[PDB]
Design a protein around this ligand. Structure first.
Ligand SMILES: [Mn+2]
Ligand SMILES: [Mn+2]
Ligand SMILES: [Mn+2]
Ligand SMILES: [Mn+2]
Ligand SMILES: [Mn+2]
Ligand SMILES: [Mn+2]
Lengths: 298, 298, 298
């Protein structure tokens, strides 16, 4: 009515006409394999519910009007197996990238970041950066019989010959939850560990600016919502005791939105089975702040 | 026993003998009409439950003894319809005001602020100020067939010929939740928008002091508890992702209590159906801090 | 596997070989007597569940490796009555103390602090300090017929002829929840009240350093988890509206761990019946930070 919100930006009767394309990845098998609580497969549905409801397109507090932006919802990736789902996701994200549009993928388990990253490495050969905003490092080895999971995505991206580890940042990781062997693996690959305490000392936005300085061009902004403290964000498989505040997350997403080198974003681990109302709202508000930032891109 | 609390201040065998009169407004129809989650009609009952239990009358941390104050509970406004409830509420609040006592009204939906404001405009003709502490602006148009709701109260107060909009402050409003047309309406009426980010930058108490400077004499302190972050205050119809902390709310209520130009207060949107224990406790602690501040008035 | 955590430190096939001994006190009768919500008797079980799961032994964010430490779980104190449970607890804690090891007692209600303190007063005659980290003072009188409870433990320790009250600190107590008569009793005994607002002004670690300066040698670090804000720590009998953050608690426990004069610790009021997942995790992370600090002791 007299209060236009995100829903209103879905004007693009055709996908190729949209600045931003939302893709859903409703799988949590990766999570279960990594010993996590099931439920993240309901993330895309919960995200969509509040997507229809939240976020003033013209925000007079930040003074950003996102009216001119065109969003499109490409629906969910559908497949018979997780492994087939990954392939279709990678293929889909690539095509959006290839024609210069911005894919935003709502999961679902963090395993989605492997295919998403692969789509990046193909769209921008030898020139990709990646930041993982996560309380965890997610460079865990695969299952004994080779199966991937919510904890392996950045092991398989660091194993990519075309990817420079100097351009990988683990952001807001927590020492109480990250093993020395996994930190060692990241650092040995020249990756950067920006611990939660360091982010908090610098300020989250300032720290993220530093991170983006390291990631450089063609950055994949990968956000695991279990990097947020569970007081603000309880609805995840691995709820954090300490972590980023909702405001820090909003501010970070806004920065990512305005940063022209950020070429795609995913958001993983939203788990409506754990908490179904407050948390999906935070997730949608995070995307909302990204949208506002993106609205300021030249 | 050896630990006197708020309950003990209810010594006034007669209402006219009390410094502060609590009035309950157990209605949430306004909320439902504004598309909100039902439940706020249980606010007064939940507030009363903890009112019997909380708040040391002599607080050695703040060094304020509220022993001398007399409180009285006038019970709930009872009526057959919301619209009749409003009239009785306005009439009741006026009489408390007219004899120089302080009415505190616990709701219930924020629609109560319309009658409460009217009672103010009558008690202090042409000389009223009003602050709305709210994540939302609440200047929404009425329903298509004229019905009021939890989102219209300040549209109907700004429409009052005796009220100066230069003396209206929307405090801790959130740009992600406030439409440009509603901000426009407030500003066009010379009202003041103090966004959450501005309150946080200044500090909540300092910002509230600034607000009171603008509201001036005969201020109505209207508090929508959905201005608090839902980590602290989950039990409301529209839970906030970001917002005021419990401590900021306590500090603000204490300031309002000590500020002699603050002539009445209401508290709206408490919803025990959403969360029944933590949230009513916060509401009672907010009133408690107001009481302590009031105890320091000359 | 390739990620060793607290569980791995339980190598000591014999108790006397451990640096730190965990003792469980699964009783909440003290709580119920003090008018509290039952459930804290499940604390030790919930604490143990996450003890098996959390806390990287080598923490690269703090740069502390706790690999060298040996922990042992002595199980629960078992008895037919609360009063017999207290005696066995005191006896057990004393023996651990007497041979120079560190007892950590997970409750259970805060009444455990009476026997724990007595074990201290015996192990270090006339030379004990005590800090109570608690939103409440816990110097309440016994029941009319003499029965103790979760609110009396520090009344019975201040009544100890061998204990100097100048070396007792009530840390992070809240004026809204502490009666003037109880504050009076503490101060009259030369005890120190460090209100939450003062702790927050100074910073929690700095304030705790000050407290330890007052407690001196042979300090008993007694932590009531209801000193934490219920946004972070909801699973307690008396949830706090405001209070210490999880991070402040972690930081405080780390300091206690590294402070050589801290000779034992207890943790009380964890109530899985109120909230069963987030809160026990916080409790285990608190112990985890203590362990890390202890790992740095000369
Ligand atoms: Mn994670
Ligand atoms: Mn992850
Ligand atoms: Mn509101
Ligand atoms: Mn409102
Ligand atoms: Mn306590
Ligand atoms: Mn206690």
């Amino acid at each position: 009515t007299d209060d236009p919100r995100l829903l209103s930006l879905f004007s693009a009767q055709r996908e190729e006409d949209a600045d931003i394309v939302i893709i859903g990845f409703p799988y949590d098998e990766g999570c279960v394999r990594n010993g996590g609580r099931a439920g993240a497969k309901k993330g895309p549905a919960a995200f969509r519910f509040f997507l229809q409801r939240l976020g003033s397109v013209n925000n007079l507090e930040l003074n950003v009007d996102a009216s001119h932006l065109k969003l499109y919802d490409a629906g969910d990736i559908t497949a018979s197996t997780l492994e087939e789902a990954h392939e279709k996701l990678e293929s889909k994200v690539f095509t959006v990238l290839a024609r210069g549009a911005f894919p935003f993928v709502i999961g679902g388990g963090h395993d989605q970041s492997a295919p998403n990253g692969r789509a990046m490495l193909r769209a921008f050969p030898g020139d990709v950066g990646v930041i993982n905003v996560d309380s965890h490092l997610d460079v865990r080895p695969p299952l004994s019989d080779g199966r991937v999971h919510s904890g392996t995505p950045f092991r398989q991206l660091l194993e990519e010959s075309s990817f420079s580890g100097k351009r990988f940042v683990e952001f807001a990781c927590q020492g109480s939850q990250c093993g020395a062997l996994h930190a060692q693996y990241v650092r040995d690959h020249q990756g950067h560990l920006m611990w939660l305490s360091e982010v908090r000392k610098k300020g989250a936005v300032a720290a993220l600016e530093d991170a983006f300085g390291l990631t450089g061009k063609n950055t994949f902004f990968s956000f695991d919502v279990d990097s947020l403290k569970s007081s603000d964000m309880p609805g995840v498989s691995c709820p954090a005791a300490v972590g980023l505040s909702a405001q820090e997350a909003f501010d970070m997403c806004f920065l990512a939105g305005k940063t022209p080198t950020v070429m795609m974003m995913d958001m993983s681990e939203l788990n409506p089975l754990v908490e179904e109302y407050r948390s999906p709202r935070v997730a949608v508000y995070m995307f909302y702040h990204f949208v506002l930032g993106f609205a300021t891109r030249p």
